[PDB]
Each structure stands twice: as C-alpha cells, then as structure tokens.
Ligand binder design. Sequence first.
Ligand code: HEM
Ligand code: HEM
Ligand SMILES: [Ca+2]
Ligand SMILES: [Fe+3]
Length: 742
Amino acid sequence: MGQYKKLWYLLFAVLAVCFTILGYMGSEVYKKAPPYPEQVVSASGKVLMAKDDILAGQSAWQTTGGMEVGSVLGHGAYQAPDWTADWLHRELSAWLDLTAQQTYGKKFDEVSPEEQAVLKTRLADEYRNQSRIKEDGSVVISDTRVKAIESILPYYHGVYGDDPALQTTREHFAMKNNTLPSQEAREKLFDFFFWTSWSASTNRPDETFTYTNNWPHEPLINNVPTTENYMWSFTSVVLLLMGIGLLMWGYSFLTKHEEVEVPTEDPSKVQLTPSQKALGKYVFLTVALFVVQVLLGGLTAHYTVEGQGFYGILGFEMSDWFPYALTRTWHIQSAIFWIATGFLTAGLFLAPIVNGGKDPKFQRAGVNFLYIALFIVVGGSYAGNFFALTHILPPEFNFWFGHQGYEYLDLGRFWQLLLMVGLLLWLFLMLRCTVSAFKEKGVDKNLLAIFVASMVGVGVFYAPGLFYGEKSPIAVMEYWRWWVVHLWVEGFFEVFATAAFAFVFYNMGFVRRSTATASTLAAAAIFMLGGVPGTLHHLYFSGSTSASMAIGACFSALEVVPLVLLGREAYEHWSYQHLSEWAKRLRWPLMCFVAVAFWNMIGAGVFGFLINPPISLFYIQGLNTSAVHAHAALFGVYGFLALGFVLLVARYLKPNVQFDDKLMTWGFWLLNGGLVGMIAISLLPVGVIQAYASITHGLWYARSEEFLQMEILDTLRWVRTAADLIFIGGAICVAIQATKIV
Ligand code: HEM
Ligand code: HEM
Ligand SMILES: [Ca+2]
Ligand SMILES: [Fe+3]
C-alpha cells in the first residue's frame, strides 16, 4: 500500500466499527420490536383479533399502496393523514367521551377541568400501563376501549370505501373512491391500524416510554419526548459544534493542495470502443426518464389542490385509473431509476478507459442485455403497480408482481430481484475491465483499488432490500429498507462519484496521483464514518429502542466534515482568467458540479440538520419539511451529478456537436430557480406552519384535513405551480440538449 497504509488502515477500522455498530443495532430490532400479540382479548373474554388478522391487515395495506396513501408510524405520503396518529387520537377521544358519560352524565367537553384531569390520568394509566403484553403473548383491553374502536370504525370504513357522506373527505385526502373495495380486507386493515396505534401508546416491558419512544406527540396520554431524547439531542448539537470548530481550526493543516501545472492537450484522446458507442441510448433513457418523472411530480401536485382532476370529460375518470397513489409511486420510482441509470452509464463509459481503451469480449452484448433488463424492470414494475392499485391483480401475487406498499421500494419482489440481477451484471461488466490494469508492473494501484471497491459497493449494496418478506415485522422491514434508501443512495454513491472524479481528474492531468489517491481515501473514510451509523436517524420512532436515538443523532452530526470543505476547492479555482484552454467549451457539465456543492451545503447540510436531532424529529417527522429536505438534497446533489455525468458522456460520444450555450444557460438557471422557488415560496412555509401546529397541539392536528384545508395552506400549494412550471421547462431544455447532442 506504500505511503497510503495509514489511510487504508483508518478506512478499514472505520468500516469495521461502523458496521459492527449497525449490525448490533440490527439484532436489537429483531428482539426489541413491538411484538404482534397472539390475541387481543376484551376484559370480558371476547377476542377482538389475532396475529394472523394483523398480518392480513398489513397485506391489505400493501394492496392500497401502503406508504404512498398517507403515512404509518411517520413514514409515507403527506396529503392523507398519518393513520397511526389519527387512529390513536380518535380512539382516545371516543374513550374520553364514553368514560365521561358513565361518570358525570356529560361529554368530555362539558366537564370541568378538575375532573378532566382525572379522566385524562385514568386514560393514561389504562393505555400505557394496563395494555402491556402479558406472559402468554396476549393483550387485554377494556370494554370501553372495545366500544371506542367500534364507534370509530365507520369513519375509516367510509374513508377507505365509497360512502357519499365522505366524498369530500376522500377528495381532500387525494384518495380514489374505492381504495380497498373489500369490506373483509378493510376490517383487517383497521386491525393493523389498531395494532400500530397500540404499539405507539403502550409502554415497553421494563420502561416508562412506549415502543415508539413516545411517538407521536399526543398530550392526552403524555406522549412527550423522553430524557434520553433531550440528552442525546444536546449531545449531538455539542458534537456538531465541536466538529465545526475543529474543522475551522485544522483546515489549513488538513488541506495542502499541491497543484499541478495545467496541460495543453486532451488525453479527450479516446478512440471509442463499440461498447462505449452503445451508451447514447443510456443517455437518452436517463433524460427521458427525468422528464417523465418531473411530469409525474407535476401531475401529483395537481391532486393536492383539486383531488380528482380538471376537465377531461378522456372519456374515463382519471383517479379511478391513475390516482394520486399511483402517480406518486411512479414519481418516486422514476427518480431512483434515472439517477441510478446516470451513474451506471457514467461507470460503463469509464470502464473501457480503465481497460486501456479496449473491449473485453462481449462487452457490447452485455451492455445491450443490461439495457434490455433495465427497460423490462421499469415497464413491468409500472404495469404491476397499475394492476395492483386497480385491484385487478389477485391479492396472493400483490407483493411479488404489484405494489409492495413500502416507499422507495414500491416495485414488486420479482422486479426487485431482476434489478438486483441487472446490478450484478453491471458489476461484472465493470470488474472484467480491471483485471489487466491490476496485472501490471510498476504502476501504483491504490487509486484503482479504491475505485474498484466503490464499484463493488454500488453493485452489491442493493441486496439488503431483499432481506424482508411480505409478513416480516414492520421494524425489521424498516431497518432493511433504510439499509438501501440511506446507505446505498446517500452512501456508496458519493464514494463512487468521488472515485470517478479523482480517476478522471488524474487521467486528464489536473491533479497529482498521490493527491487524488489520498483525497479519495479520506473522503471514503469520512463518508463511511458519517453515513453507515447515520442510518438510524430514520428509525427513531419505528419500534426501535432508545439506543437508535443515541447512535443516529451523534454520528449523523459527524457528517458535517465533507459537506463543508466541499467545493471550497472550486471557489479556490473558479477565478481562472481564461485558464480553461479546452474546458470552457464544456463549461456546463463541469458547472453541474458547482450547483452540486451548493445544494450539498444547503439542502443536505442546513435542511438536513434542522430535522436531524431527535428532539426536532419527534415533532416534524411526517411533515412537509421532510419533502423540502428530500427535494433539495436528492435532486440538488444526485440529480445534478447524474445530469453532469450523462452530459459529459454525450460530449465524448459526439465531439463534433456544439452545446448551444443559450439553451444550456436557460435550462440550468430554470432548474436552479425552480427548485429554489418551490422550496422557498410553497414548501418551506407549509412545513413551518405544520411544525408549529404539531408542536402546539399534536401531529394528529398538523395532519388533519381541517388543518390542511385552511385558506392559507391551499393558496400556498397552488402557488407552487409557478415554480413547478419553471422546473419542468428547465428539465425539458436539458433533455433536448442531450437528445440534440446524441
Ligand atoms: C416539477 C417538479 C416537481 C414537482 C411538482 C414535484 C412534486 C412532488 C409531490 C407533489 C410530491 C408528493 C408529496 C406528498 O406526499 O403529498 C413529491 C415527492 C417527492 N419528490 Fe417530487 N416533484 C418535483 C420534482 C422532483 C425531482 C426532480 C425529484 C428528484 C429527482 C423529486 C423527488 C421527490 C421525492 C423523493 C419525493 C418523496 C419525498 C418525501 O416523501 O419526503 N421530485 N414531489
Ligand atoms: C445528499 C444527501 C442526502 C439525501 C439524498 C437525502 C435524502 C433523503 C430523503 C429523500 C429523505 C426522505 C425521507 C422519506 O421519504 O421518508 C430523507 C430523510 C431524512 N434525511 Fe436525508 N438525505 C441526505 C442527507 C442527509 C443528511 C446529511 C442528514 C442529517 C444531517 C439527513 C437526515 C435525514 C432525516 C433525519 C430524514 C428523515 C425525515 C423524515 O423521516 O421525516 N439526510 N433524506
Ligand atoms: Ca415520505
Ligand atoms: Fe438519511
């Protein structure tokens, strides 16, 4: 390893420690997740439900879209109410009304606060302590609780069915007129909802807080943040402040920046291999998927202000066939697909360059096979989502060929397996080009080794999404799912981008070999240190114990080291005085990387940390601030990276076509202005108002229909269309430039 032995050892130690921590917390989730009770029995002896009924309700929830229609335990969509919190509040209000009648003969509202406190204390004792699971695995609830459940059932039956008395409510929730047509399936789904509400309001066996760390905020049962929550939030802010102070104090020593002399030629000296020439279809697929995804996002926003549609007398009803759940699922899946496609194309273009400008036998055939597999995956998953949400798909094939119901993993298990096979094919095609480069003499191989390791990580770490099943517990499913939406996208993709950037810069002669290798190794070590144990900030209130708040909060704060220095080195080199001898013509792909740094600083650093401490997330999980952070971080870092990658690939495929700077300036600035406007004028104010309402009254109230249909919040969502149109125009401009080039 030569002079990089210390960096390699530090990376190894960081990897070992961080995966040991993450794996230990994984085994804790299997043993400490909220159990499914064997029986839920009334105090008189009548069984309400059983474990099989709860699991059947979970499967029924998966056939409606799951997280893509409302929210369960804080994860999902944001137009329909959070179901666990809404059910808890309605059952607590019904219990209070019933108990006030048998004690004072009046309702809860018309009773003096002195006895309201007594009623609230009796509710808190009954719900948090008397509902604890027993030795035999059963839960005993009172007849008053049974009556409250029976009283609140008809509202949910009308909401998830087609009752005329609840038509307006269904429209405000962006829900089709029959989300779950089967009454028997609706009854099971309400059992599942009750189970989630029970797990969110019942103390742990040997603790004074619930299985969800007192989530959601519910003043009626005193579901408030715990001392551990406060203690670890304070610790995480203190760690972030130290880290920032230490990075300021040591930036001078840490970064030496031994710059090299700028060359004159273009080592652009790339006789293109047949496999490289077959990536124009990849570039076109990336930009077409980007345009389709942006259009699907515009179509989902329209459902949040109208509910069913406008005009289209065209002869069918559109929410019956392409409802909000379907449009949002496709919108989320297309974004994942096109960002991943851009990264995979970029890698496939660099592989033959690593191989010395030659194709290993059958590389073009492998590339074409991968293209066909990616097309089949996308088309089949979308068709399965359509047929599952229309309920034409029989329910026993839903989890495998329809809608999984889990966000960011909505595609069926069969399509997930096909995508995994395609990713392994891509890794094989990348790795077969490295054998000759490794089998050389004299040349240092540390940068190649770190690049190959980042190849293996991207091509491998989609597997943890197959470690749960249809009937797997929700907390296990959430753990394995964030192993993919956070560790594989947020992590292992920055590593790939960094290792490709270093490889390209070294082979263009912009940086020294030692500088590139050391920078890549250090960046990989800091990204793994801040990202691998930072997975747990998605599991603070998902049935995990209190150790998740601690780990996720403290290490996620450690992910401040890269974000800051990011791009300083660009402003250190932005002022060039026509130093771009052969780079000002390609100014656009190289400027997608300055907006990348800006959005990494803003969307991922500012908006990502205001939601990170558990004391904040306790109130703002499930609100529009999550949408703000998601849009900013995801497109501003990774969509721009992928767009720059496919623009740079298209530049080398067709070096005789110039870039039309007037269409490029328009597209770039329309994208950046549209993103800025959609957060700053619509998304952020809605999130702030929702956060205030949540903190003051309850997450139930911040997600309620009565609160979302306020005059200020409907005009705040309509105004978004102005920035949405600008963003769609910018996306269309970029996609035309790319199509014109290839
Ligand atoms: C015209 C531009 C866009 C519009 C109008 C738009 C609109 C929307 C809407 C309406 C939602 C659903 C919020 C809800 O639950 O009610 C959403 C969610 C989302 N959008 Fe977009 N979007 C746009 C562009 C993008 C882009 C470019 C990306 C990234 C490639 C993206 C990624 C996402 C993600 C990841 C979510 C889910 C976020 C979450 O659940 O927190 N969007 N968007
Ligand atoms: C570019 C890097 C990042 C990307 C692409 C990214 C992406 C996302 C996305 C799409 C979500 C949506 C969650 C959902 O739909 O359920 C999310 C949630 C979250 N992210 Fe990030 N993120 C990034 C960096 C960060 C950083 C640096 C932090 C911490 C400082 C962070 C903390 C969170 C938290 C706490 C949530 C949960 C919000 C909620 O569940 O309601 N993220 N992230
Ligand atoms: Ca979400
Ligand atoms: Fe995350």
